[PDB]
Structures are given as structure tokens and as C-alpha cells.
């Protein structure tokens, strides 16, 4: 279903293909979105409450775990995020059979994509701000993209 995660420079001339994930998120809306990438830990409600950066109008990246993918997306949707990236921090191997179950059996309101940990680590290289020690995640974790960088998420259909 031809998915792609791309870091685009705000000068409009440079971009860097992070990953074209072979796996698709079942019931994700098919679209392309571009904006800031904000790390929201696991995407739980408390994670979003303790977040400094407003996710409204931004792509959020979350770790798999604690809650379903649908609940992560539903919280990001509620806070007016434009897209969601999901990755596992405990393995390099990609998420398989990623799935979104919503009331009414419909799709997400925003594009949702699973990415490998290597892909997440690449995004973190273009991101600033150490993640809180309380998250108990890899030292490569970063919070928000630098001002000169946006993430272009494309989920195909
Ligand atoms: Na940014
Ligand atoms: Na849940």
C-alpha cells in the first residue's frame, strides 16, 4: 500500500527518505501529511497531559504498548494531531499485523503508520530535546523535530 516516511527540509529543496514501511496499519486513513513530529511516549492520556509541546497540527510518534493502537490514535485525533507514527523501542524488527479497531469499524481520521526502530532512530537524529528519564527508553529518543525539519508521512490506499 506504498507507505513512506520522509524528512523534508523547510528550505523546500532537501528531503531524506526515512523508510517505506512494507507493513500497513489496517483501517488507517490513506493520505499524506506534513508537519512537526512530536514524541508522545506511549500515547496514553496521561502522556499527552504531561507533554509540553502542543500536538495540534503536528505528527505524533508513540511507542507500542500499554494501550491499543486505536486508543493512541484516538487520543492523538482528539488533540488535533495530523498523523501518527508507531514504533517498538525494544526491537529492530517491524510491527506486524498492525490494526486499528474503532467504533463503527471505520478508519482513523488521520494517517497512521508503523515504522521500524531504525526508522524512529533516524527521525530522532533530526529531532531535539532529550526524552524524560522516566520514559525508560533508549538514549537516542528525542522529543520534537528541529525548526528546519518537518516529517512527511504518506499512507497509501
Ligand atoms: Na519542527
Ligand atoms: Na486500549
UniProtKB/Swiss-Prot annotation:
Which ranges form a coiled coil?
none
Tell me what induces its expression: Regulated by cellular iron levels through binding of the iron regulatory proteins, IRP1 and IRP2, to iron-responsive elements in the 3'-UTR. Up-regulated upon mitogenic stimulation.
Q: Superkingdom of the source?
A: Eukaryota
**UniProt-annotated location(s):** Cell membrane; Melanosome
**Residues annotated as glycosylated:** 56
Kindly provide the PTM information from the record.
Answer: Stearoylated by ZDHHC6 which inhibits TFRC-mediated activation of the JNK pathway and promotes mitochondrial fragmentation. Stearoylation does not affect iron uptake. N- and O-glycosylated, phosphorylated and palmitoylated. The serum form is only glycosylated.
Cite the PA domain residue spans from the record: 28-104
Query: Could you share any additional remarks the record makes about this protein?
Result: Serum transferrin receptor (sTfR) is used as a means of detecting erythropoietin (EPO) misuse by athletes and as a diagnostic test for anemia resulting from a number of conditions including rheumatoid arthritis, pregnancy, irritable bowel syndrome and in HIV patients. Canine and feline parvoviruses bind human and feline transferrin receptors and use these receptors to enter and infect cells.
Q: What does this protein do?
A: Cellular uptake of iron occurs via receptor-mediated endocytosis of ligand-occupied transferrin receptor into specialized endosomes. Endosomal acidification leads to iron release. The apotransferrin-receptor complex is then recycled to the cell surface with a return to neutral pH and the concomitant loss of affinity of apotransferrin for its receptor. Transferrin receptor is necessary for development of erythrocytes and the nervous system. A second ligand, the hereditary hemochromatosis protein HFE, competes for binding with transferrin for an overlapping C-terminal binding site. (Microbial infection) Acts as a receptor for new-world arenaviruses: Guanarito, Junin and Machupo virus.
Record note on quaternary structure: Homodimer; disulfide-linked. Binds one transferrin or HFE molecule per subunit. Binds the HLA class II histocompatibility antigen, DR1. Interacts with SH3BP3. Interacts with STEAP3; facilitates TFRC endocytosis in erythroid precursor cells. Interacts with GRM2.
What's this protein's family per the entry? Belongs to the peptidase M28 family. M28B subfamily.
The entry's linked illness reads:
Immunodeficiency 46: An autosomal recessive primary immunodeficiency disorder characterized by early-onset chronic diarrhea, recurrent infections, hypo- or agammaglobulinemia, normal lymphocyte counts, intermittent neutropenia, and intermittent thrombocytopenia.
Quote the protein name from its UniProt record: Transferrin receptor protein 1
Q: What species does this protein belong to? A: Homo sapiens
Complete-protein stretch covered: 197 to 377 of 760
Amino acid at each position: 500500500m506504498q507507505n513512506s516516511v520522509i524528512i523534508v527540509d523547510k528550505n523546500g529543496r532537501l528531503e531524506y527518505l526515512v523508510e517505506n514501511p512494507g507493513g500497513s496499519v489496517a483501517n488507517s486513513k490513506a493520505a499524506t501529511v506534513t508537519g512537526k513530529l512530536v514524541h508522545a511516549n506511549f500515547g496514553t492520556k496521561k502522556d499527552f497531559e504531561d507533554l509540553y509541546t502542543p500536538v495540534n497540527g503536528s505528527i505524533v510518534i508513540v511507542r507500542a504498548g500499554k494501550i491499543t493502537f486505536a486508543e493512541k490514535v484516538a487520543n492523538a485525533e482528539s488533540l488535533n494531531a495530523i498523523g501518527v507514527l508507531i514504533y517498538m523501542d525494544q526491537t529492530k524488527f517491524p510491527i506486524v499485523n498492525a490494526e486499528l479497531s474503532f467504533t463503527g469499524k471505520g478508519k482513523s481520521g488521520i494517517p497512521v503508520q508503523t515504522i521500524s526502530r531504525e526508522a524512529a532512530e533516524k527521525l530522532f537524529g533530526n529531532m531535539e530535546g532529550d526524552c524524560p528519564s522516566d520514559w525508560k527508553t533508549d538514549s537516542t529518543c528525542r522529543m520534537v523535530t528541529s525548526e528546519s525539519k518537518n516529517v512527511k508521512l504518506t499512507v497509501g490506499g
